[PDB]
Structure formats: C-alpha cells, structure tokens
C-alpha cells in the first residue's frame, strides 16, 4: 500500500505513522497506535472511563497542548488488547499520504 | 527501507516525501525531490526559479529550469535546502 503520517491538527507536528497503526474504533472515531512520537505527551493524571470502567491517562501534543486522545492503563480482562495502546482521535490528527 | 517525510522548517507543513527522492552526489546542501506537495510554491550558469512554502513564505529551495547537458538530471527537480526543511522518519 502507501503509508501515512499523522500530524497534530493544531500545529502539524508529527504524532506517528501507519507503520504502528494496529487497529481502529468506529464509535470513538479513534485510531490505535502501538507506538507514538516524542510529540505525544501523557498528562500524568488517571481519569476514569465514561463508556461501555477503565482507567486512562489523556494524550496531548507536546507542542501546542491540543487534546489528542487517551491511553488505556488499567482494564478488565476483555479489554487487555487495548491496554497501553495510544488512541488518537481522528478529529485531532491530519494524515499525510506518501506518494504524489 | 523506511521512508521519510520532509516538512517546512517554519510551519511544519508537509513538502514531499522520500518516495520521490533522487539520489544525487553532486550537491551537498540540497535534497532532490522529483515531485512535491501543494505546499511547495514556485514563485516569480543556470536559469532557476525559486521555491518557497505555500503556507508561510519561507525560502525553501529552487528548480533548475534551463540546464546544460551535464546538469540535465537536476532539471525540473525540486532542490529543497536542508537548512530549510526537517524530516520525520517512519517507524519512530
Ligand atoms: Zn500540536
Ligand atoms: Zn512553511
């Protein structure tokens, strides 16, 4: 195929690429990355989950402090696969596609 | 192996990527790209118009338009100054 780079919406810093893109979520409109760049920082405050409850710290761009998503830190057995993966909101990243 | 994405030193807009890279050893301060993104705006002894960034105006490089035989490779390629771009490598 052709790989992607994900850029912060608020300032265009590189957040990650499709090489670490493991999975997606249709309802939360997030993509799940195994691996992120130095520009995704982790607000060290554990907040509870408000959906179908996990513990998860929120992600934001080291550059402009835009809210980028969340990481699952603590999860029940059924959600262990999402644990430690970076969920990036689609409404907060912009894709650049390689190949012109 | 893994590809690169080149980006404007000034506003981080994407310029182009290593998929278009032209391996040259003649020039020592420019990356040669066979094609570039919408963000590389071309504006206004070789004739060569100047490249700059469509978002922020930063002088980015140049394009050799008229060349002699020995420079025919550089012709119509976008030379991005490595002092005016940055790169993100995929897999990081
Ligand atoms: Zn940002
Ligand atoms: Zn720029």
Residue numbers in the entry:
A (entry chain A): 78 to 129, 133 to 180
B (entry chain B): 78 to 121, 133 to 180
Can you quote the paper on this entry?
The overall fold of the Mis18α_Yippee_ is remarkably similar to the previously determined *S. pombe* Mis18_Yippee_ homo-dimer structure. In brief, the monomeric Mis18α_Yippee_ is formed by two antiparallel ý-sheets that are held together by a Zn^2+^ ion coordinated via loops containing C-X-X-C motifs. The Mis18α_Yippee_ dimerisation is mediated via a back-to-back arrangement of a ‘three-stranded’ ý-sheet from each monomer. As observed for Mis18α_Yippee_ homo-dimer, the Mis18α/ý Yippee hetero-dimerisation is also mediated via the back-to-back arrangement of the three-stranded beta sheets of Mis18α and Mis18ý Yippee domains.
To preserve centromere identity, CENP-A levels must be maintained through active CENP-A loading during the cell cycle. A central player mediating this process is the Mis18 complex (Mis18α, Mis18ý and Mis18BP1), which recruits the CENP-A specific chaperone HJURP to centromeres for CENP-A deposition. The Mis18 proteins, Mis18α and Mis18ý, possess a well-conserved globular domain called the Yippee domain (also known as the MeDiY domain; spanning residues 77-180 in Mis18α and 73-176 in Mis18ý) and C-terminal α-helices (residues 196-233 in Mis18α and 191-229 in Mis18ý). Here, using a multi-pronged approach, we characterise the structure of the Mis18 complex and show that multiple hetero- and homo-oligomeric interfaces facilitate the hetero-octameric Mis18 complex assembly composed of 4 Mis18α, 2 Mis18ý and 2 Mis18BP1.
